[PDB]
Design a protein around this nucleic acid. Structure first.
Ligand SMILES: [Mg+2]
Ligand SMILES: [Mg+2]
Ligand SMILES: [Mg+2]
Ligand SMILES: [Mg+2]
Ligand SMILES: [Mg+2]
Ligand SMILES: [Mg+2]
Ligand SMILES: [Mg+2]
Ligand SMILES: [Mg+2]
Ligand SMILES: [Mg+2]
Ligand SMILES: [Mg+2]
Ligand SMILES: [Mg+2]
Ligand SMILES: [Mg+2]
Ligand SMILES: [Mg+2]
Ligand SMILES: [Mg+2]
Ligand SMILES: [Mg+2]
Ligand SMILES: [Mg+2]
Ligand SMILES: [Mg+2]
Ligand SMILES: [Mg+2]
Ligand SMILES: [Mg+2]
Ligand SMILES: [Mg+2]
Ligand SMILES: [Mg+2]
Ligand SMILES: [Mg+2]
Ligand SMILES: [Mg+2]
Ligand SMILES: [Mg+2]
Ligand SMILES: [Mg+2]
Ligand SMILES: [Mg+2]
Ligand SMILES: [Mg+2]
Ligand SMILES: [Mg+2]
Ligand SMILES: [Mg+2]
Ligand SMILES: [Mg+2]
Ligand SMILES: [Mg+2]
Ligand SMILES: [Mg+2]
Ligand SMILES: [Mg+2]
Ligand SMILES: [Mg+2]
Ligand SMILES: [Mg+2]
Ligand SMILES: [Mg+2]
Ligand SMILES: [Mg+2]
Ligand SMILES: [Mg+2]
Ligand SMILES: [Mg+2]
Ligand SMILES: [Mg+2]
Ligand SMILES: [Mg+2]
Ligand SMILES: [Mg+2]
Ligand SMILES: [Mg+2]
Ligand SMILES: [Mg+2]
Ligand SMILES: [Mg+2]
Ligand SMILES: [Mg+2]
Ligand SMILES: [Mg+2]
Ligand SMILES: [Mg+2]
Ligand SMILES: [Mg+2]
Ligand SMILES: [Mg+2]
Ligand SMILES: [Mg+2]
Ligand SMILES: [Mg+2]
Ligand SMILES: [Mg+2]
Ligand SMILES: [Mg+2]
Ligand SMILES: [Mg+2]
Ligand SMILES: [Mg+2]
Ligand SMILES: [Mg+2]
Ligand SMILES: [Mg+2]
Ligand SMILES: [Mg+2]
Ligand SMILES: [Mg+2]
Ligand SMILES: [Mg+2]
Ligand SMILES: [Mg+2]
Ligand SMILES: [Mg+2]
Ligand SMILES: [Mg+2]
Ligand SMILES: [Mg+2]
Ligand SMILES: [Mg+2]
Ligand SMILES: [Mg+2]
Ligand SMILES: [Mg+2]
Ligand SMILES: [Mg+2]
Ligand SMILES: [Mg+2]
Ligand SMILES: [Mg+2]
Ligand SMILES: [Mg+2]
Ligand SMILES: [Mg+2]
Ligand SMILES: [Mg+2]
Ligand SMILES: [Mg+2]
Ligand SMILES: [Mg+2]
Ligand SMILES: [Mg+2]
Ligand SMILES: [Mg+2]
Ligand SMILES: [Mg+2]
Ligand SMILES: [Mg+2]
Ligand SMILES: [Mg+2]
Ligand SMILES: [Mg+2]
Ligand SMILES: [Mg+2]
Ligand SMILES: [Mg+2]
Ligand SMILES: [Mg+2]
Ligand SMILES: [Mg+2]
Ligand SMILES: [Mg+2]
Ligand SMILES: [Mg+2]
Ligand SMILES: [Mg+2]
Ligand SMILES: [Mg+2]
Ligand SMILES: [Zn+2]
Lengths: 99, 99, 124, 138, 208, 83
RNA sequence: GGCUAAUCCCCCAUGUGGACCCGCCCCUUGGGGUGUGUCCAAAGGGCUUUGCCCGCUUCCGGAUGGGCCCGCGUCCCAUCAGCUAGUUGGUGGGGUAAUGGCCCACCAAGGCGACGACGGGUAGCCGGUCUGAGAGGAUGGCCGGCCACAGGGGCACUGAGACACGGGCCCCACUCCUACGGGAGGCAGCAGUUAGGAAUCUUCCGCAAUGGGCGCAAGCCUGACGGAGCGACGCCGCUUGGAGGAAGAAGCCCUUCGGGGUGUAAACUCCUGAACCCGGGACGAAACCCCCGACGAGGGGACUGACGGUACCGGGGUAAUAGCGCCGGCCAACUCCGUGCCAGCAGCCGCGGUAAUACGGAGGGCGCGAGCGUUACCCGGAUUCACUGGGCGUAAAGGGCGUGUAGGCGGCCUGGGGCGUCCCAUGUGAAAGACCACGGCUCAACCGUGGGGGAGCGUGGGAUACGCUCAGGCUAGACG
């Protein structure tokens, strides 16, 4: 009995609590941006969207949120931000997106 | 070679979709006679261009939905309702032979 | 039949039905005896045939013929079932393996010892 | 309606020869004419010719038989010992080029309708094509 | 293990002379002389007409007993001959003649077939410089079949080759009597063998 | 990792190897991609090793990794010899 | 609760490049290029420490491996005829590496079925294998490919990759520990135990080979594997002697009592030398490694055995296992005695109620022979489900008759198309097996090398007789 593959399981749990955490952050930022786009605040929503994109690419850096899943999240995020922004648009910051 | 078939549009009633009937001849594997069997494919009509009774070509496509893997390539011969009437009569014959 | 009729309905394969539900399709099946009996034969013959009712390891209850001249088989002895019917005794669809598990081979049998299961004698 | 003209012609010939007739009138068509041409070239019939029966076109097939024989039944030996349609409506028969049969170990013929026309078995094999296997004759 | 026991009783049962005794099937003692009838209590009785299966069976038995093989190798070699190109009967006979022990008998090294099988089995026989003790070994055309120098001093071999002086050898064979060599030139054809056997009957026997 | 190794295809006490290109994760006697030689350890024939070098050169150019024994046999036929 | 290191984790910078929204272009489903804007990188260790090695980061591509999709093929029951509510489609959304009712909300009312839906029964599938003249039938053990499962059921985490046999969570059954609160388990891995069963092996040897995982390497791990063991379970090869030897010993058998048989068979004469004894004794093994050359090429060198002192070679050497089935016909092999519708044989026909070639023994014979029989099962014969290849007046079989739906089938002439049909080229048809040739173990079984073949499907091209289709025409069928 007592095979040291147990170690893997141990490590597994660690990695779980990492990935989860990161992922949660992403989501909580994404909504935070989208809401502000729905309420017509261009600059703040843009800032939050930039932070969210950075977080997404950093999660893609590790085994948490790797290949084009991250591109999916970024594409959906920027699409919804630019679309929701078009209610008396006024793209204040203009940084996060292409003019 | 993405498979290309030819059939008659036998059902209109769906949104952005047509039901096509595609026939096929082949020799019976033992008794050798030429037997003719048909099959209904669901084709994707994006512009609602094709109507009932049209003879169209169907092309193997990236799946649009469940049961939908083909798109209407082009119109071949428009408006021969005799085949449609044959299909309708065959389906209507099912009212008998039950109880 | 027309060719079109053969396309529509086609020839029907004929199913075989096993004459021997000595189950699992096994070559032999061991069981325990219930009766050791002497039975009268069918119309054209006349004799006293030694048979045995058997409960089987397959949960079956059959009747088997006792080959040879004399048998040591009794009411509660275990035996093996070989299969094969007796033409003149309706009911016995199986035979008994002699020299196996309780049923010693035929004594003073010197001609055919593969069947009837008796060991080779010695010549002084 | 007549449902198989080719088999009908073959049977007309079969019956006419079985009663030792001199000729037989078969309703005329180009395909029948080709079959008859192959037969005449292969020596199974004396020949044939177009004719008009009550204004409708027909084909007079002149059959040939053997010599009169000895003993009982002096009826001459048949030249068309056997004729049999193979690919009939309801079960069409098609053969490749390796699937062309040798009729009666070569003493007979197999008539094929191929892309290059109506040929015999030897003709189709030397031409290298297959097609619809119409009939055996030997 | 092939058939081992009284032999000339098979000289009698087949009704024809098959010299598996070597000598003494030549001198007036084969028991085919003055006793041609089959063995047993019913030997001298009248022979009822044999069925077709009987004829085919006795012919195949005649052949197999002549060559001394078992039915297993016999039938397997027969299937082998049937698969090859050519007449099954002549090919079968040539394959039986290609047996090493039968070649040793054909080259006159041994008096009989069984003696040749023993001379092979004990390693007294050389094939292309090497020893072979397998009687079922097949000799290809061109192989040299000699006697190992260890056995060249043997009295039996010198006796047999002493009698082989002036005697003739099969047309598909050749031998040097002093050097005890020999050569399987070619496969013998149906005519080359004087076997009193109708091979078509063996073929018809294995048809069933 | 696609590799180049040996598959034992002889019989008991009669080993015969096929020098073979295959993914390392399959059985050593299982399905392979290409058969690019055969090795006979007992050397019972005049030719007991053949390679067809240029194919091995290709498969090495794409990243196959030969076994130490496979590499030894490939070098014996000069897949690596570059003069 | 406290301390601490790193190729563990985080932030910033550099942006080769990449990702994303928007615009443009070329392509055409989400392919490629481009512009601006936003976001994104990393790690060190080792020595012969001035250089190299083992690594790390972003990206393009290659390779191998897979995911998803589609045409076609894939058992039985119609005494299973209607099935369907995420069910069919749409819009938007979620999820994934990726399409998708995969999931979700809203909208539409669809989808499938006699060309076998739905239901029930059975079943891993294939390369192949067995049989068969072939078509076909049957089968899928072993080897190879794919799938599925890891006590039963569900679920996700980690990761390039799992919904994970020797990982995790929960429910259920069972076994074990228990301080009664709670725990530990998972051989369909190699042996082995037990149960069940007619029945299926050693708790073996070994890392020497081949392959795998990690490592710079040395090396470690490997019940994959290479061998050995047990079982006539199969295949193949081999022995139980060879030659001489009586018009023919005894015994046994039959008899017409004269004899016939066992039978050259034995005894015996000579020769060879299975076993066992003695000695030599392997191939499988060359790299990794060392050293020269620059850790390359190249050259050369050296360590490395389970099998096993086995295979094999040389020497010596003894005549030294035979059994099983059958003998009425099919079917090859016959007599005597004994038993008397008893005792029994039997695949079918049938034997035995006083001469039994059919029961039991003997003698003799036939068939095979380290086998021979039996049972079960598959194909065969069986043209007895008939495509090849059958039938329906009286033998099984014309439906009581009609009307007509679907379907099947379609007169003559011309033309267009080229769907069937045919031809060529090519791709695919893995390996093994099968076939052919050569070869390696003294032969074979076994194995290697090479060659050939191949239905089907993909693509390109061609032919148009027939079938089809479209257009036109005709009157012999049909109708008026
Ligand atoms: Mg570890
Ligand atoms: Mg939150
Ligand atoms: Mg992941
Ligand atoms: Mg519509
Ligand atoms: Mg859709
Ligand atoms: Mg309905
Ligand atoms: Mg009676
Ligand atoms: Mg032959
Ligand atoms: Mg010659
Ligand atoms: Mg045969
Ligand atoms: Mg794999
Ligand atoms: Mg190179
Ligand atoms: Mg702490
Ligand atoms: Mg702590
Ligand atoms: Mg600290
Ligand atoms: Mg890191
Ligand atoms: Mg940065
Ligand atoms: Mg740049
Ligand atoms: Mg930029
Ligand atoms: Mg539901
Ligand atoms: Mg819903
Ligand atoms: Mg909508
Ligand atoms: Mg969607
Ligand atoms: Mg259908
Ligand atoms: Mg099952
Ligand atoms: Mg065969
Ligand atoms: Mg199957
Ligand atoms: Mg399987
Ligand atoms: Mg196994
Ligand atoms: Mg399960
Ligand atoms: Mg489970
Ligand atoms: Mg990993
Ligand atoms: Mg995943
Ligand atoms: Mg699983
Ligand atoms: Mg386990
Ligand atoms: Mg595991
Ligand atoms: Mg646990
Ligand atoms: Mg038990
Ligand atoms: Mg084993
Ligand atoms: Mg190793
Ligand atoms: Mg290794
Ligand atoms: Mg070092
Ligand atoms: Mg260990
Ligand atoms: Mg093993
Ligand atoms: Mg036994
Ligand atoms: Mg054997
Ligand atoms: Mg006497
Ligand atoms: Mg003797
Ligand atoms: Mg001696
Ligand atoms: Mg060695
Ligand atoms: Mg060596
Ligand atoms: Mg140096
Ligand atoms: Mg070197
Ligand atoms: Mg080593
Ligand atoms: Mg040793
Ligand atoms: Mg010796
Ligand atoms: Mg003796
Ligand atoms: Mg007889
Ligand atoms: Mg008997
Ligand atoms: Mg009496
Ligand atoms: Mg009597
Ligand atoms: Mg009587
Ligand atoms: Mg008797
Ligand atoms: Mg009998
Ligand atoms: Mg008897
Ligand atoms: Mg006897
Ligand atoms: Mg057996
Ligand atoms: Mg049968
Ligand atoms: Mg049949
Ligand atoms: Mg037949
Ligand atoms: Mg029947
Ligand atoms: Mg028929
Ligand atoms: Mg009949
Ligand atoms: Mg009647
Ligand atoms: Mg009747
Ligand atoms: Mg009637
Ligand atoms: Mg009636
Ligand atoms: Mg109609
Ligand atoms: Mg027509
Ligand atoms: Mg039609
Ligand atoms: Mg075409
Ligand atoms: Mg091809
Ligand atoms: Mg092949
Ligand atoms: Mg091969
Ligand atoms: Mg050889
Ligand atoms: Mg084509
Ligand atoms: Mg044309
Ligand atoms: Mg035309
Ligand atoms: Mg018209
Ligand atoms: Mg008119
Ligand atoms: Zn003799």
């Amino acid at each position: 009995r007592n095979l040291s593959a147990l170690k893997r399981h141990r490590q597994s749990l660690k990695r779980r609590l990492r990935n989860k955490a990161k992922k949660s952050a992403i989501k909580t930022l994404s909504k935070k941006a989208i809401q502000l786009a729905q309420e017509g605040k261009a600059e703040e929503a843009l800032k939050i969207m930039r932070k969210a994109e950075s977080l997404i690419d950093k999660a893609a850096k590790g085994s948490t949120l790797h290949k084009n899943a991250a591109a999916r999240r970024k594409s959906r995020l920027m699409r919804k931000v630019r679309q929701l922004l078009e209610a008396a648009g006024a793209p204040l910051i203009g940084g996060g997106l292409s003019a | 070679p993405k498979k290309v078939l030819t059939g008659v549009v036998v059902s209109d009633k769906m949104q952005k979709t047509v039901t096509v009937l595609v026939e096929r001849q082949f020799p019976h594997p033992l008794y050798g006679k030429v037997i003719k069997r048909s099959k209904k494919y669901l084709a994707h009509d994006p512009e609602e261009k094709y109507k009932l009774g049209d003879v169209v070509e169907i092309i193997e496509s990236r799946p649009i939905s469940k049961r939908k893997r083909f798109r209407v390539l082009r119109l071949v011969e428009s408006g021969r309702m005799d085949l449609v009437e044959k299909y309708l009569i065959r389906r209507q014959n099912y009212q008998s032979l039950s109880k | 039949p027309t060719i079109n009729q053969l396309v529509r309905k086609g020839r029907e394969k004929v199913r075989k039905k096993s004459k021997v539900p000595a189950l699992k399709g096994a070559p032999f099946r061991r069981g325990v005896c219930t009766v050791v009996r002497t039975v009268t034969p069918k119309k054209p013959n006349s004799a006293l045939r030694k048979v045995a009712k058997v409960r089987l390891t397959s949960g079956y209850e059959v009747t088997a013929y006792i080959p040879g001249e004399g048998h040591n088989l009794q009411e509660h002895s275990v035996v093996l079932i070989r299969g094969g019917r007796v033409k003149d005794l309706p009911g016995v669809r199986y035979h008994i393996v002699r020299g196996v598990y309780d049923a010693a081979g035929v004594k003073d049998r010197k001609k055919s010892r593969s069947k009837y299961g008796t060991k080779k004698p010695k010549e002084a | 309606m007549l449902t198989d003209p080719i088999a009908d012609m073959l049977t007309r010939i079969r019956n006419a020869t079985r009663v030792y007739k001199e000729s037989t009138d078969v309703p005329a068509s180009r395909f029948k004419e080709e079959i008859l041409r192959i037969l005449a070239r292969e020596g199974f019939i004396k020949g044939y010719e177009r004719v008009d029966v009550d204004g409708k076109p027909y084909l007079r097939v002149y059959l040939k038989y053997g010599p009169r024989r000895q003993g009982p039944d002096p009826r001459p030996e048949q030249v068309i010992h056997h004729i049999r349609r193979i690919s009939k409506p309801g079960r069409r028969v098609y053969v490749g080029v390796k699937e062309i049969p040798r009729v009666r170990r070569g003493l007979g013929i197999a008539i094929l309708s191929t892309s290059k026309g109506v040929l015999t078995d030897r003709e189709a094999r030397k031409l290298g094509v297959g097609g619809e296997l119409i009939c055996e004759v030997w | 293990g092939r058939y081992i026991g009284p032999v000339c009783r098979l000289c009698r049962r087949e009704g024809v002379k098959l010299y598996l005794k070597g000598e003494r099937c030549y001198s007036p003692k084969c028991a085919m002389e003055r006793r041609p009838y089959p063995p047993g209590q019913h030997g001298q009785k009248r022979a009822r007409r044999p069925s077709d299966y009987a004829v085919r069976l006795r012919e195949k038995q005649k052949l197999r007993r002549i060559y001394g093989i078992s039915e297993r190798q016999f039938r397997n070699l027969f299937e082998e001959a049937s698969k090859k190109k050519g007449v099954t009967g002549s090919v079968f006979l040539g394959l039986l003649e290609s047996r090493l022990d039968n070649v040793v008998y054909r080259l006159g090294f041994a008096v009989s077939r069984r003696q040749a099988r023993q001379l092979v089995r004990h390693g007294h026989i050389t094939v292309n410089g090497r020893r072979v003790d397998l009687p079922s070994y097949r000799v290809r055309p061109g192989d040299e079949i000699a006697v190992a120098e260890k056995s060249r001093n043997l009295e039996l071999i010198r006796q047999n080759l002493e009698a082989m002086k002036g005697r003739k050898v099969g047309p598909w064979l050749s031998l040097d009597v002093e050097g005890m060599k020999g050569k399987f030139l070619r496969l013998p054809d149906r005519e080359d063998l004087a076997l009193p056997v109708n091979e078509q009957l063996v073929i018809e026997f294995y048809s069933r | 990792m696609v590799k180049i190794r040996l598959a034992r295809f002889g019989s008991k006490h009669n080993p015969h190897y096929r020098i073979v290109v295959t993914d390392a994760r399959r059985k050593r006697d299982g399905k392979y991609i290409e058969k690019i030689g055969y090795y006979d350890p007992r050397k019972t024939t005049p030719d007991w090793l053949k390679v067809d070098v240029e194919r091995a050169r290709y498969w090495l150019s794409v990243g196959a990794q030969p076994t130490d024994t496979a590499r030894r046999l490939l070098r014996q036929a000069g897949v690596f010899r570059q003069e």
